[PDB]
Amino acid sequence: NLYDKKLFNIWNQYERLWIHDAFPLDVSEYNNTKDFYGYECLFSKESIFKILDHSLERLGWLYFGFFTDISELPYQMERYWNEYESMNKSADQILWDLVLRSVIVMTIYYMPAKSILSLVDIDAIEKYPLELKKKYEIFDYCLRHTLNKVLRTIFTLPPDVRTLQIFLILSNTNFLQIYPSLGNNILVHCIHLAKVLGIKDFKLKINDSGSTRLQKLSMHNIWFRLSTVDYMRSSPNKIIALHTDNSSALTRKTLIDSIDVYDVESNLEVLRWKITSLDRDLEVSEPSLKTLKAMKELLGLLDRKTSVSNDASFNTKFESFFLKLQCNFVMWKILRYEFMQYGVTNGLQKLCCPARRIIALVANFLKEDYFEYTTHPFCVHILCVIAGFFSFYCIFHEADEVRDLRNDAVGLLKLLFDPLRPVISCFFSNLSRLEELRHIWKSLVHPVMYVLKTDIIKLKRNLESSDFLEVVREFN
Amino acid sequence: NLYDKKLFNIWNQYERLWIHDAFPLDVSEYNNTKDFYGYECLFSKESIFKILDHSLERLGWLYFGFFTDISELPYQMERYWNEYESMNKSADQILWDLVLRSVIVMTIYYMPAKSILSLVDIDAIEKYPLDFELKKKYEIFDYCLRHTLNKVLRTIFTLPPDVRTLQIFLILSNTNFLQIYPSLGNNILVHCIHLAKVLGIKDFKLKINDSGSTRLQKLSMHNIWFRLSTVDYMRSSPNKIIALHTDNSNLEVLRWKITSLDRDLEVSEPSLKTLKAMKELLGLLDRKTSVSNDASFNTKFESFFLKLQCNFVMWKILRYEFMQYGVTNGLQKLCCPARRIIALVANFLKEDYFEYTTHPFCVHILCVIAGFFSFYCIFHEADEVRDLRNDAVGLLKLLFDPLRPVISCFFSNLSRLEELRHIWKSLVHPVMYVLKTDIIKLKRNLESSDFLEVVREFN
Amino acid sequence: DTKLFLSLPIDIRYTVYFFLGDVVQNVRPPAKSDIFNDELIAYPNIREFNQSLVDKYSKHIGVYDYIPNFIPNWCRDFDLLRHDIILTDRLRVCLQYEEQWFSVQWIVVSGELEIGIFTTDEQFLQVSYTINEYCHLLSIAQQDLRLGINVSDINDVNELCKEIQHRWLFDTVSYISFINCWDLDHENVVSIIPCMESFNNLHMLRIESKNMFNNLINTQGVRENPGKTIVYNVRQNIFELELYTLRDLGYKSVVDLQKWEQLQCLSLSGCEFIDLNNLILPQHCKMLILKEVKYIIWWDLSHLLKRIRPQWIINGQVKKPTKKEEEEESEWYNLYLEVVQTYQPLNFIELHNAKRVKGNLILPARLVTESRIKISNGTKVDSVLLI
Amino acid sequence: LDSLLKELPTRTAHLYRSIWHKYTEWLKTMPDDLKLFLSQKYIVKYIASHDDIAKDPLPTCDAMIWFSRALDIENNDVLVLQQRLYGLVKLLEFDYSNVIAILQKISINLWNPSTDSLQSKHFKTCQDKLKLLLDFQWKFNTNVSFEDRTTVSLKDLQCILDDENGKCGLAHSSKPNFVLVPNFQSPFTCPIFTMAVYYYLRFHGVKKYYKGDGYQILSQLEHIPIIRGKSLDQYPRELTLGNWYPTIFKYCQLPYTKKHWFQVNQEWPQFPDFSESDSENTIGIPDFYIEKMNRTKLQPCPQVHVHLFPTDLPPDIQAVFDLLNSVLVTSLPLLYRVFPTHDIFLDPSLKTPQNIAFLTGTLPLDIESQEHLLAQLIDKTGTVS
Amino acid sequence: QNVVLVSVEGERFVVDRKIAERSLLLKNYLQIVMPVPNVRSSVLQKVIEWAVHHKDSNFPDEDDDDSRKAAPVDPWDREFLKVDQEMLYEIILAANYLNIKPLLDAGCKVVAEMIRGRTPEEIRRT
């Protein structure tokens, strides 16, 4: 039981090192790489307009949250097409080019295969390097081209807000979990741009026109999405941060430009940041128990406010899905902390219930032919950690409930996911390793926990019949 | 005289906004733009080795301070030449390539014109754009710089985190670079700061039973981190707000100390025992400074720069005193530091080391000095200050091609300020009212009052 | 039984002890109003009454000594309440969440230090324990703790604690209380004001009287008494605050506390009148806690109520949907912003039952949709509206 | 009312009720109805028994005030009572004899018949020295205003002789209110002994040297002043004494503040005011007041068989003069052994074979007692010990 | 409407649906049969006996501590719970499982009465 608490601390560190689990190093390889974007290159004008139509239909969420007006986008699009045709420069035009390109790439990542495969041209396949694999390879080619263009035009540029939007528009992809160091560096640059422009002046003032209100609103949405990612993507590879400049929503007892919450606005970006701050206060800062009681009450209240959102269109289902997903995930983390540290009773069953809710949700979103919405990386992080802990306590203890839930999670995740092949493959191999560890422990400073001590030591140094036990260690 | 204290603070902010004062958009115009480094391209490897010899002779200071071993550099050079010859990749090789290129560029910035003009090829001048002196030298220097920058912008993001990027930036900071391409420099500075905090380079806390290699590693880390804080204070306009000089509180230490006194001067609580302790401490550090004895070019260079920093900061401190608390004889006791500075730059002209004068820090210094001297020359009379200011401005116009826009802009607005003397020469005065308007114009440019506005509109 | 009760989880024991707040002794003194009534309850009891504790601890006990046999009761109570494992888990658990139940501070009697655990209302004593006993029961550390001044603990005893946590020990204490000694005098302030330098674990204060408050705190009464008031470095280090027990806070008063900076939470209880329009504050302090008092005078909000139309009003809540009516939309935002700017440095307002508020409540919806505005059923108001 | 009772802290109020209980019980000790309960007499009796409460009488007195205003009492009554009570806390909160070596240091020097270092005009005789000394010892013991000092007619004075309880002294129940008591432990610093010698000199006089005033005028005169100036019937003038005083403080080398001796001194204890004795009180006054302010235990009047003062007089004054006789005659052999050169001894009366007999007989107390006192004078006499 | 409930022994008790929607764990689990792990038969019988005795009753809140410590021990409950300690503790744990607070509050009230109406000899054994 004290052993349980200790190995649960070990599992904390082991999940950190779980999650701490090609690109050419030279832009000039893409110096002359063709396009997808010319009239004859890959993607006709009309295909692109269709893509934007689908995007505004299904996935308004992101860029709706950012910009002021969005007929702006087709307007600028057609203007750029006219200018391109006339040319057979400036800053505005190139920025808007990058913006539309990134918008598109997001839409590609969240499209069904058959549609895009019907849209794409043909002989350009002969021109280019070559189911879902075709979709993802063409997506990757488009991504790398956009990345070349945008790296160049990022450095060589004045500071303008729209660069930030690019990153945020692209963070909702495999990108940051496929090109991590790159992403972290550019995130640092975007953080600098954030603090540059004084976007902390979403402090809404008196007698401001509607335009000014909308500007501050855009700033506000931007800031909070940025703080979300900056906490969510904060491995020791990064030490510079912005998630400190906000403040916890907890109303603590034990305690300027540091922004507080509940004093500003109500747009659900705020809600996401609140939830992330609760996770943050769980992880890094003082873990208490009255703290958890208040957090749990507050999170039930916010789950009410989440389900207040009523079904009227795809994007609404998407948002409510992601919010309820986050809420149950954080409840699961809290109740994990409880049942791991202080052994309150029935918390295990009241913890298993959230997992069942999550899995009912993703089942609903497969069965409704919304599998593309499932592909958000946060969902995959979630299933990763869940399967991790469930395998852990399934091998250390027996409960057919746990076996069933874990088997559902892993059968789902294996049978459904190509996209994030490196991460999932590393996780799957080390998971099968832990299953062989089940065979070991099934066949008290145990040698198995000693092997896991060795494993964390291997990782910590990777930062910068004991004979047979070492034998199986070498075997795996 | 209280009016003097207030308007001296106003001149402080106006100098702040002074110091808070083409390269293309899509890095593709320079996609295929010529090297200087190839066998047939521009410079002849052996000439380059000669350049390196000249660099190591006179200017070990910078890169001697950074790296561990420096035969490393000719070693890597010859290795790349062999590899270049064999080729007719990896990360290490590209870093070292860029390293030597930047080293060379520093050497270019601190070379005489006639020499390099003798080195450069001829039909390669026909290959490239001309400007045909120093203007030619500076145009070819600019081309080399922009080429290097093209190369490094691409290759910065796409890399693991390695120390040597920092070395690049530091080798390149000692140039016109940051005051001609500021925003670029600031962004790369932010990235380098991230790399600094990544690697835990605050672990120069030297420990027991470490090898000499480890001592040298920690020394390099120490010098680098502190040079970084030096630049990060000196180059901290509101365009950048992220910083590392907050994390503070071998003579690299000494330079950082001097910067911390300047910081405490500018931003924090002005007391009087504070200034007394600072000035005694700086005299102590002048003792520690003069302990260095003249024995070689780099040594004269270093001791020059250190004495320059010390007198500049003393000048700032004593200015702060005489503005805020009005002690007597301070004008002359302030003029003396300037005279010491000027004896130093005189030494470095007479010794035929004018190239060493071209460091941007010296020009920032002379800028602020001539600024304050013009201020108190027009508002008050002292032929000493007038004479020194005339020396400074005649010097700076007659001697300095490199920073042509800034000095010229400064000179032009400075010549504008001489007409303001005539105004004040022709009491909440309209002139101080004009300076209120002027600081407001600049701060908002960031993001017979009739005749006074008339002359304002004329200029 | 005992071990059956101890084979159980913590929430159970928590709620149980919450119902058993603090009654560990077999007795209780009254409030003040029940004094002049000559009715004494009953305490006919007998010996096992050592003359080692009744003589020692009388400075907090012998005040009463005027009833049926109480001190032998008290004496055997203190005796038997050194072995209640009940109590040890009571304290392990109450400490675990929050000791709003037991007020626990330092004491010295006979020149011998101990740690006493009292009521909260005025801290009638219950028992005490030795530091080594305490942290053999628990883990030893600089476990933050409380302290208050009585006529029992004033100056030399107080300076004895000072010099003991200098010489023998270190200053393991945070929070300071002014429960009596309302005169600003008879050596309490004289002792303590030079003594807040080794005193750097704290953020928290508790105050009693309008005399002591007005003559120490309310910074309009400006003077030049250096040892009579605080050093301002502690005025930085006081993120929390508490106060009780007065009649007329703000009736034509000088209510303003801008010097009281780096404050982050206020607590008020047990009073008889208050108005918030006189109230002025620093920034940084939004947590406001307010307990059972008489009728409150809210902010005015009268002109702003005159600004309003029933164009939009529904169910006590309002909004403009019409983007076209920037006239009405800008007006809406002007109204909302005036509203919050009245409450500007506040985000959390707790009321226990105060029986009345008089001042035309119109509030935002962002906060009452949540539990920021946390009123008990002091439901004697009707002029409610939300934004 | 009840709100005023609510106005207070809580520990203090519990304490107050406990003390109400205690005082009610200690009053149940006696047969005996709220001012009789909270009576100055009964309260001071309680405190005389409860010296423990005299250690923390601050809330004691404040609670007594709080009850004296709790019920229907005239507010003037409780505040004049409060004036008396502040007098009491001032009296009791100080328990040592600090205002004292100034007494000693002076009294002695003013007794000393030969003062050489004194070149000052006044103080030629021993009667001048004694006149001043009586005024000083008197203020010092009774703490009274000067003006009031001159208001008192000695026919007003009342001898207290109670041998049942063993008390003796001189009392005044009139405008200034006070009680004087003989110090037999320290005759020199005793104001009554002083007054006895001075009165012998004043009245009997010294044959062939200084005319007595005669004992006859104690009738024909309406006001007999405790000390006479130029005129028989009047106290000396204020500025006169005001001169005499610094003159002596100088010679004694003690700092002098006129306000101390010519006006009431508040840092100092006082008798209460009241608008023939018994066990625990004398004129109006509890005895501890009197023993404290006169700083001597109360003792019965010693019976002497020798009469220096007249045994034939008006009944009114007689008792007084008999008291004076006993103190004088009790302590005279001592004065004779110290200052045999004193004017008093120059009378032929004191020269008789008997009076010489008793002056040279057993000593009232051993010599080695008054050493320290003697060490305090700046002219050593012919007899050095 | 009604619902079946499996005592983990396996006993398929039955309740009226909404009278069980009194509870909150149910009110979420549904939003007909349910399992009930680690509960026994007479346990749930007495549980539902209380639940049916208290259907139209009013209860203050789960935050009003003043109303909570305002402590009317219901007399029906008071006699209804005159049983031994282990079944009692199982009732208490079950109330914790089910988020049905007033019964839990009453149980803790009674246990507090047990350990308040005490004897020193309980300690003299210690």
Local structure of residue C195 (DSSP, 8 states):
G
For the record, the structure tokens of B195 come out as 């790399």
Write down the residue that tokens 């832009």 correspond to. A27
Q: Across the interface, do C20 and E65 touch by the CB < 8 Å criterion?
A: no
Q: Has residue A116 been placed in a domain?
A: yes
For residue B194, how many other CB atoms are within 10 A of its CB?
22
Give the closest-approach CA distance of B368 to chain A in angstroms: 26
Q: Are residues B323 and B306 in the same domain?
A: yes
* Of residues D254, D230, D255, the one with CA closest to residue D241: D230
Q: Are residues B120 and B102 in the same domain?
A: yes
Residues near A232 by beta carbon (within 8 Å), at least 6 away in sequence = A276, A378
Q: What region, left, alpha or beta, does residue C159 occupy, with left being phi > 0 and alpha being psi -120 to 50 degrees?
A: alpha
Q: Are residues A275 and A327 in the same domain?
A: yes
* Of residues B107, B184, B175, B186, the one with CA closest to residue B149: B184
Write down the residue that tokens 């809330």 correspond to. D59
Q: Which of C65, C66, C122 is opposite residue D11, by nearest beta carbon?
A: C122
Strands D210-211, D205-206: pairing kind: antiparallel
Query: Does the CB of C203 have a partner CB in chain E at under 8 Å?
Result: no
Give burial (CB, 10 Å; 0-12/13-18/19+) of A71. Answer: exposed
Give burial (CB, 10 Å; 0-12/13-18/19+) of C164. Answer: middle
Q: Has residue B422 been placed in a domain?
A: yes
Q: Are residues A150 and A217 in the same domain?
A: yes
**Contact (Cβ atoms closer than 8 angstroms) between residue E88 and residue E81:** yes
Give the closest-approach CA distance of C65 to chain A in angstroms: 39
Residues near D28 by beta carbon (within 8 Å), at least 6 away in sequence = none
**Contact (Cβ atoms closer than 8 angstroms) between residue C237 and residue C274:** no
Outline where D178-237 has alpha helix (H): 191-203, 217-220
Q: Has residue A308 been placed in a domain?
A: yes
Q: Is the dihedral of CA C133, C136, C139, C141 positive or negative?
A: positive
For residue A460, how many other CB atoms are within 10 A of its CB?
11
Measure the CA dihedral B349/B355/B361/B365, to 10°: 30
Q: Partners of C363 in the beta sheet?
A: C386
Contacts of B182 in chain A (CB under 8 A): none
Q: Is the dihedral of CA C91, C97, C98, C101 positive or negative?
A: negative
Q: Across the interface, do A23 and B158 touch by the CB < 8 Å criterion?
A: yes
| Cα–Cα distance for residue pair D194/D139, rounded to 1 Å | 13
Query: Does the CB of A25 have a partner CB in chain B at under 8 Å?
Result: yes
* D16: nearest CA partner in chain C: C63
Mutate to test the interface with C, among D17, D56, D62, D67 (most CBs of C within 10 A): D17
Method: cryo-EM
Q: What is the DSSP string of A155-186?
A: HTS---THHHHHHHHHHSSSGGGTSHHHHHHH
Q: Alpha carbon of C23 to those of B76, C58, C120, D42, E78: distances in Å?
A: 82, 20, 12, 41, 22
For residue A275, how many other CB atoms are within 10 A of its CB?
21
Q: Do chains C and D touch (3 or more CB pairs under 8 A)?
A: yes
Listed by the residue before each break, gaps in chain B with C–N over 2.5 Å are 21, 88, 132, 249, 426, 447
Instruction: Kindly calculate the radius of gyration of chain C based on its CA atoms and give it in whole angstroms.
Output: 25
Q: Do chains D and E touch (3 or more CB pairs under 8 A)?
A: no
Q: Partners of C242 in the beta sheet?
A: C206
Number of separate domains in chain B:
2
Write down the residue that tokens 């003359």 correspond to. C51
Question: What is the distance, to the nearest Å, from the Cα of residue B317 to the centroid of all Cα atoms in its chain?
Answer: 20
Contacts of A262 in chain C (CB under 8 A): 347-348, 366-367, 370, 372
**Contact (Cβ atoms closer than 8 angstroms) between residue E23 and residue E99:** yes
What residue ranges in D188-246 does DSSP mark as E strands? 205-206, 210-211
Q: Subunits that touch chain E (at least 3 Cβ pairs < 8 angstroms)?
A: A, C
Domain E1-126 grouped into CATH 1.10.443.10: no
Q: What is the DSSP string of C216-244?
A: TT-TTS----TTTS--SHHHHS--B-EE-
* C31: nearest CA partner in chain D: D10
| Cα–Cα distance for residue pair D234/D240, rounded to 1 Å | 13
User: In a 3-state reduction of DSSP, which class is residue D171?
Assistant: strand
Q: Which of A345, A349, A353 is opposite residue E93, by nearest beta carbon?
A: A345
* Of residues B89, B62, B88, the one with CA closest to residue B73: B62
Give the closest-approach CA distance of A213 to chain C in angstroms: 9
**Contact (Cβ atoms closer than 8 angstroms) between residue B439 and residue B13:** yes
Last residue of a domain, one of B226, B249, B272: B249
Q: Over chain E, what HEC string results? A: CEEEEEECCCEEEEEEHHHHHCCCHHHHHCCCEEEECCCCHHHHHHHHHHHHHCCCCCCCCCCCHHHHHCCCCCHHHHHHCCCCCHHHHHHHHHHHHHCCHHHHHHHHHHHHHHHHCCCCHHHHCC
Resolution (A): 4.3
What separation, in Å, do the N-terminal and C-terminal C-alpha atoms of chain C show?
A: 54
Query: Does the CB of B130 have a partner CB in chain A at under 8 Å?
Result: no
Q: Are residues B259 and B343 in the same domain?
A: yes
**Contact (Cβ atoms closer than 8 angstroms) between residue B240 and residue B20:** no
Question: What is the distance, to the nearest Å, from the Cα of residue D59 to the centroid of all Cα atoms in its chain?
Answer: 31
Q: Has residue B458 been placed in a domain?
A: no
What separation, in Å, do the N-terminal and C-terminal C-alpha atoms of chain D show?
A: 68
Contacts of A158 in chain B (CB under 8 A): 183
Give phi and psi for E63, each to the nearest 5: -135, -20
User: In a 3-state reduction of DSSP, which class is residue C149?
Assistant: strand
Q: Which amino acid belongs to residue C60?
A: H
Residues near E9 by beta carbon (within 8 Å), at least 6 away in sequence = E40, E41
Q: Across the interface, do E96 and A349 touch by the CB < 8 Å criterion?
A: no
Outline where B88-162 has alpha helix (H): 92-109, 113-119, 123-127, 135-157
Q: Are residues B185 and B109 in the same domain?
A: yes
Q: Over C59-95, what HEC string results? A: HHHCCCCCCCCCHHHHHHHHHHCCCCHHHHHHHHHHH
Give burial (CB, 10 Å; 0-12/13-18/19+) of C295. Answer: middle
For residue D369, how many other CB atoms are within 10 A of its CB?
13
Give the closest-approach CA distance of E8 to chain C in angstroms: 21
Helix (H), strand (E) at residue A106: helix A92-109
Q: Are residues A217 and A111 in the same domain?
A: yes
Instruction: Kindly calculate the radius of gyration of chain D based on its CA atoms and give it in whole angstroms.
Output: 23
| Cα–Cα distance for residue pair E37/E98, rounded to 1 Å | 11
Residues near E18 by beta carbon (within 8 Å), at least 6 away in sequence = E1
Give the closest-approach CA distance of E1 to chain C in angstroms: 33
Q: Across the interface, do E126 and C20 touch by the CB < 8 Å criterion?
A: no
Q: Do chains D and B touch (3 or more CB pairs under 8 A)?
A: no
Q: Across the interface, do A156 and B154 touch by the CB < 8 Å criterion?
A: no
Q: Is the dihedral of CA C85, C86, C87, C92 positive or negative?
A: positive
Q: Which of B94, B160, B242 is opposite residue A181, by nearest beta carbon?
A: B160
Q: Are residues B142 and B35 in the same domain?
A: yes
Q: Are residues B277 and B136 in the same domain?
A: no
Q: Across the interface, do A288 and C348 touch by the CB < 8 Å criterion?
A: no
| Cα–Cα distance for residue pair E41/E43, rounded to 1 Å | 5
Q: Across the interface, do C376 and E66 touch by the CB < 8 Å criterion?
A: yes
Q: Are residues A215 and A289 in the same domain?
A: no
Q: Are residues B277 and B411 in the same domain?
A: yes
Q: Which of C64, C122, C180 is opposite residue D18, by nearest beta carbon?
A: C64
Domain that holds residue B384: 1-21+250-447
Q: Has residue A259 been placed in a domain?
A: no
Per this entry, what is the length of chain D? 385
| Cα–Cα distance for residue pair B104/A294, rounded to 1 Å | 63
For the record, the structure tokens of D116 come out as 């050489």
Instruction: Kindly calculate the radius of gyration of chain E based on its CA atoms and give it in whole angstroms.
Output: 16
Residues near D114 by beta carbon (within 8 Å), at least 6 away in sequence = D341, D379, D381
Query: Does the CB of B22 have a partner CB in chain A at under 8 Å?
Result: no
Mutate to test the interface with B, among A156, A157, A233 (most CBs of B within 10 A): A156
Q: Across the interface, do C83 and E126 touch by the CB < 8 Å criterion?
A: yes
Q: Which of C20, C23, C80 is opposite residue E120, by nearest beta carbon?
A: C80
Strands C125-129, C112-118: pairing kind: antiparallel
Q: Across the interface, do A343 and C9 touch by the CB < 8 Å criterion?
A: yes
Give burial (CB, 10 Å; 0-12/13-18/19+) of E33. Answer: exposed
Q: Are residues B227 and B290 in the same domain?
A: no
Give phi and psi for C297, each to the nearest 5: -110, 100
Mutate to test the interface with A, among C330, C331, C349, C368 (most CBs of A within 10 A): C330
| Cα–Cα distance for residue pair C125/C116, rounded to 1 Å | 7
Q: Has residue B456 been placed in a domain?
A: no
Maximum alpha-carbon separation in chain E? 55
* Of residues B75, B35, B32, the one with CA closest to residue B52: B75
Q: Has residue B457 been placed in a domain?
A: no
Q: Which amino acid belongs to residue D225?
A: P
The domains located in chain D, with CATH, are: 2-93 (1.10.150.540), 101-374 (1.10.443.20)
Give phi and psi for A200, each to the nearest 5: -65, -10
| Cα–Cα distance for residue pair A204/C133, rounded to 1 Å | 57
| Cα–Cα distance for residue pair B166/B228, rounded to 1 Å | 9
Q: Has residue A262 been placed in a domain?
A: no
Q: Partners of C109 in the beta sheet?
A: C112
Q: Across the interface, do C180 and D11 touch by the CB < 8 Å criterion?
A: yes
